[PDB]
Design a protein around this ligand. Sequence first.
Ligand SMILES: Nc1ncnc2c1ncn2[C@@H]1O[C@H](COP(=O)(O)OP(=O)(O)OP(=O)(O)O)[C@@H](O)[C@H]1O
Ligand SMILES: Nc1ncnc2c1ncn2[C@@H]1O[C@H](COP(=O)(O)OP(=O)(O)OP(=O)(O)O)[C@@H](O)[C@H]1O
Ligand SMILES: Nc1ncnc2c1ncn2[C@@H]1O[C@H](COP(=O)(O)OP(=O)(O)OP(=O)(O)O)[C@@H](O)[C@H]1O
Ligand SMILES: [K+]
Ligand SMILES: [K+]
Ligand code: NA
Ligand code: NA
Lengths: 431, 431, 215, 215, 215
Amino acid sequence: TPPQVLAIGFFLTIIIGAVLLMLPISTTKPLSWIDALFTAASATTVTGLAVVDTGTQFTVFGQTVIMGLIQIGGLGFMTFAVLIVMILGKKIGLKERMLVQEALNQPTIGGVIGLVKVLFLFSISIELIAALILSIRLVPQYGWSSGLFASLFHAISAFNNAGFSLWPDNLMSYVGDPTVNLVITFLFITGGIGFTVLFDVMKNRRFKTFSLHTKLMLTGTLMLNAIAMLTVFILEYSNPGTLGHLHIVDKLWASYFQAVTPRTAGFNSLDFGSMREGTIVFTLLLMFIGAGSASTASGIKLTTFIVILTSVIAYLRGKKETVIFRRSIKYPIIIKALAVSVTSLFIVFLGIFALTITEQAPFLQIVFETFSAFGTVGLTMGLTPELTTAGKCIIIVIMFIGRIGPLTFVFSFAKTEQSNIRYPDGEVFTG
Amino acid sequence: TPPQVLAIGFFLTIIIGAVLLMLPISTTKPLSWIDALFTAASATTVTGLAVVDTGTQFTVFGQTVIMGLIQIGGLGFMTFAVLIVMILGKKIGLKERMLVQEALNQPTIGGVIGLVKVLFLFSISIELIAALILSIRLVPQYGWSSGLFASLFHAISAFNNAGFSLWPDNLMSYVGDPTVNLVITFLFITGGIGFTVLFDVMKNRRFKTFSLHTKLMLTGTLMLNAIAMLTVFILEYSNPGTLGHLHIVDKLWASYFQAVTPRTAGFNSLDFGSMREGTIVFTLLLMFIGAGSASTASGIKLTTFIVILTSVIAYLRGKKETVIFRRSIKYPIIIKALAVSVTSLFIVFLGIFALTITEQAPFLQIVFETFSAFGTVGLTMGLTPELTTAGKCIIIVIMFIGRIGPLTFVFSFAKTEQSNIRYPDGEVFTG
Amino acid sequence: KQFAVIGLGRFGGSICKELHRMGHEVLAVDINEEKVNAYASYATHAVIANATEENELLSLGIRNFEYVIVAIGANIQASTLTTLLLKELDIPNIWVKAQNYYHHKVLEKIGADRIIHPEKDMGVKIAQSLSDENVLNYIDLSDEYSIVELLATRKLDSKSIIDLNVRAKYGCTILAIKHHGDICLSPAPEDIIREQDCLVIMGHKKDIKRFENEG
Amino acid sequence: KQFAVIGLGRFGGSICKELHRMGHEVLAVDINEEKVNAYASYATHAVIANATEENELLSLGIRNFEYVIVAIGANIQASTLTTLLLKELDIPNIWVKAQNYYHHKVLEKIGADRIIHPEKDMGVKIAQSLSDENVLNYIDLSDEYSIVELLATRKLDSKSIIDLNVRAKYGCTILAIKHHGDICLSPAPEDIIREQDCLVIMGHKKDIKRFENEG
Amino acid sequence: KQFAVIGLGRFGGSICKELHRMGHEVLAVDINEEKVNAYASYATHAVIANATEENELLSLGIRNFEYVIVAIGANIQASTLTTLLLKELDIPNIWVKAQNYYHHKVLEKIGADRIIHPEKDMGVKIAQSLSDENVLNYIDLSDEYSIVELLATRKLDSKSIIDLNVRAKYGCTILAIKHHGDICLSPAPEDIIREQDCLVIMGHKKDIKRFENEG
Ligand SMILES: Nc1ncnc2c1ncn2[C@@H]1O[C@H](COP(=O)(O)OP(=O)(O)OP(=O)(O)O)[C@@H](O)[C@H]1O
Ligand SMILES: Nc1ncnc2c1ncn2[C@@H]1O[C@H](COP(=O)(O)OP(=O)(O)OP(=O)(O)O)[C@@H](O)[C@H]1O
Ligand SMILES: Nc1ncnc2c1ncn2[C@@H]1O[C@H](COP(=O)(O)OP(=O)(O)OP(=O)(O)O)[C@@H](O)[C@H]1O
Ligand SMILES: [K+]
Ligand SMILES: [K+]
Ligand code: NA
Ligand code: NA
């Protein structure tokens, strides 16, 4: 039932948001029922896939509804539910505390209500500061009416790993700008690193005092971004479409930006449709892995990928246990990572299989769209505007399962029956 | 060292076979050093990928070398090694018996020498019978000189899951022929079901007396071929290129043949280059799964796929153990299946990544070629003749690791150090 | 008929192997992991479970079995609690292996359909063979009449059936004579009695003992 | 300096926590899983291992530690075998916690650089405080001279240092006086002695006892 | 020759290490996980298995070994049930380590080809060295004749072989003399006998004892 409340509550925000975006006040042009549902779903799942342009289709009131859905979806449904109860004065019960444990993917209910207070106060604080830093650049270019709103929209979009942009070019006019690049990359890296990771750094200022999860996220993100930055820079250096007609300083900014944006923000500075096939293959893995178990990102998490990778290497080296940072990893941690990765690949495989039947598109664009939708990244190669009515409905299901997680989606409709009986061992050759 | 003998011995057969095919006696046309190495590697790994046509490039002596490499590679290097020692009169030692255990993927050395006697006698018996059955059809069409050799070549090719064909069209002229379809499909289904599975059926004539592995292979193959036959027939029914201009009887034969050929024979009756993208996606998952742990097939095995799939479903249903056919499955069986599947996907990912850098080809053909090469299936969409010199070298590595298995390849160069020390448990969130 | 055998001991495991030999669906339940692994091949279904737990008992589908045999005869608490659960679950036939006289009385109170003493019944039959070495196997038709498979002595060699006045004097009827693996069913007068082989007789319990001593 | 502490007991775990507090690299080795999990946060590296095994000892990189402390004082076999391995591995400093007199003699034979009796040394120091309640803590400079931190009595209240003839009669030197958490280092004549607080004195062992009884 | 050693104790592990040193294929079987890990490097193949189980014994390919050594000498039930299985599997040579006299009698009944008493045979040989300190090592050719490697005394210093009338009076033959690590094979008369070194002699059992007492 705690997984059932998450599934029902997260689905109701799509329906409420779809009605608000479909009103004539919130839009400048007539909008289809599927496009309103797709835009609402792409906001609460915080993916960023846009059939229609956000700046032109929606009004200022319509974009305010987008910011509400991004903020609600980015921080989670139960994060704001506790705040409403706390403001009204009602005390948080044991039943209400178990919902927070399931929503934040926590193993224990020890100090989980206080974590929500920290992460909500940190979210509004860092989005307000980043809007002020972006205000020094967006105001002389777009005045005071639009410059302040563009900074506020993008600070919320970047921190929550959304990738929504008001401009027709999604950050393609700020390739060489250090102000936009440094501030926005600081937002989704810190916003996607994990709320538990941020809380550990705030209370502990020394690296040796960090937990195993915090040390995995800090070292894992640094190593993964370094490999991605080298891969994009080497592969796309001679590409004429992207990273070719740019200065050496501008090549370093665009390579750094495209290394960190697939996990899982989905902003861009170069066109992904004109990149080589080698870089797209490496991004598929890149955006299949997210960042942080309790964060604004999705996909399989960075810690899930490291746990599985280390467990295999330990088996290949003959070791009897998985050891990272001189800490053993128990069997329940391994089997949970196994269930996340296998279920995620099965859903992605069904998404690619269903899209090839429906959509008439190149195969590389279909695979890129499904990995982007499931990981809630939002990067496109030119397929989302070309999707049919049946194709958009498949992506909405993919984005919904991707944000809520494959495990919590299955636990909604999979009743658990407890049986203490056991069975004799059977030998099966799995070579 | 038992994995090291397998890797060294299997690689030496490629070098010996490459020299024999490069002689002017064995070929009618000049052959490149890479094409001779590719053809030799595609035979001992029993894949069937052919840059040049087997019938035209090679003579009768050259095709006899192909049959030798298929038979040696199909049954394994150590299978014939025991026979040579037994013929010479030398007794099989404990050290020689441990090599057979590693080659056949057996858990114990109990009765493993006698299994080699059964599987070798069964192989020559069923290939001789099937050549006689094919002789009643191939002789009136190709005379006595070529009709007898065509039946002998194809019986060995089909049983060992090779897919090599002397004709320019790989079995595309026998779509509606029940004689060719039934006999050849009977060969690689029984030849790929597993040598341990065949030995259990021979000694036990009742299903309730079968082991867990035998019951998994018999029921798993029947269910997997039924789903594949329905999927190919439904998706390709309206396709004009394949299965469109055929009778209802001929549609049932071609749908049945294409359902069973990706695991892992690689014969065909319809052109895979003209199929829809939906069928190709289902075929990649189909040929990523092989058949039988100790057989002539490759890829991850059918039992590996079932063990992982049942382990996840048990976790999603809240069950504390993996139970198939009312038998519990221990943790060492699960982790071995986990290591096979993760290592296989990592090698396939590196193969697709390396081929996209080198080859200028459509992405669907690159993914299809890598899954076909790693699973040693040999199905093509039109890429193998178009591979460059660097592209062919990548496929040879992929075919080599795929046949020997990802685990036995890694164990060759991964030294095992035993440490009895343990570490304190660390908590890492893998949601 | 579907049978469930709970407790795979020397007595319980013999019922599982014999019923599986005859071609019956047997569920073998034991709390020991090693016992279940040994009898997995000798039963249709073998489960590691505790029978004193109702939740584990309902997970076996135990309501689908007409006969349940509780072959636990050294743990009275496990034996009596199991049959209390099965009686509550309305099992038509519950056969329980008892330990002593007091365990027999508890199982009779809580509704055990048949109570079995395997070692006590065999010990009585063995002690009959120790007391008189002439007998080999006997079956008690009643408290006064029995069928005893005697062993031929040296004085009965080269003797005809009509010579033995069992029908007239002893009041006993000779049923069957077995000679060197060949069994003669209902012999007719007269047949020569060979050396020390089987000799089935029927009569009163006191009358057979007179035949052994006199002849 | 790299330290390895083998055996995380009351004595071994205190060395791990104190050395980790001072900022030292400590390897905590114990055969108990629960002990290692408790001291994982109080040590640089904590390993579950058996120290009597040479293969497990070499897996720790124990040759890289200058100081190894074997804090096993209830298992003589585990304690003596461990230090035999470490002596064979040429560890420069091996400090072993002993159990009794016979355990001390074995470790001296097999080359233990320093042998420690934690409970025996504390019991002697505690028994000195029980015998004379005027003392609080003492340190034995030699077998005849010691520094004793005395406790002020009621008769020493409102008394100056020059009034106390410790230097002339008793032959003892007053070292430091602590008043209500404030410590006076090397007081000069004369200072008024307050109520029952610390009073550090130095002199002969027999001479301090005369000062306690007379004053 | 392929050897299987079942039970890796002090006696069984010594056979594994010695046969592996000579270059033989040894299968080391033990029920203890730690024993198998220790002897994994000292055996061609080391398996953790229970030898009393026929299914586990057939998984080892035990029918391919000409010699099987059952080195279990403290568990009679494990020792006798193992060799009953191996005898049923038609192993040509089964060598069993016994515990006492009654264990020796059981293994002789169930068909053990050779029965070994390692501690009993060494204790008899050691007690011969305790009783007479002049002997160092002896080998019993029969019940009355033996070859004894004596130790030279102080009275035998600077004595020639011809001076010692062992051949005539004692009826014993001097076989070999070892001097400071140098061994003289079949010395010829006459050689000077040095200080307390080895002196191999051969003769009757009672005659050698006379030589020790007189000379
Ligand atoms: N609660 C239980 N549920 C299921 N099986 C049980 C339970 N308690 C005991 N058993 C099993 O029942 C079997 C027989 O019980 P036990 O050995 O106590 O009786 P017994 O009279 O000595 O047996 P037998 O004479 O048949 O050898 C054993 O294998 C034991 O593990
Ligand atoms: N072989 C061993 N290797 C490593 N640690 C060991 C070994 N044997 C015992 N220990 C651990 O050493 C620690 C201290 O040993 P033990 O409790 O026997 O001694 P002690 O003198 O009673 O301890 P203390 O007085 O410090 O509490 C325990 O935590 C014990 O688990
Ligand atoms: N059933 C069994 N199968 C295999 N190994 C066994 C079995 N039972 C015992 N062993 C092993 O046999 C070895 C030797 O047996 P055990 O220690 O009982 O005999 P022992 O006479 O004391 O030995 P030793 O004098 O050689 O040290 C031990 O390592 C023990 O674990
Ligand atoms: K996003
Ligand atoms: K093939
Ligand atoms: Na009994
Ligand atoms: Na103590």
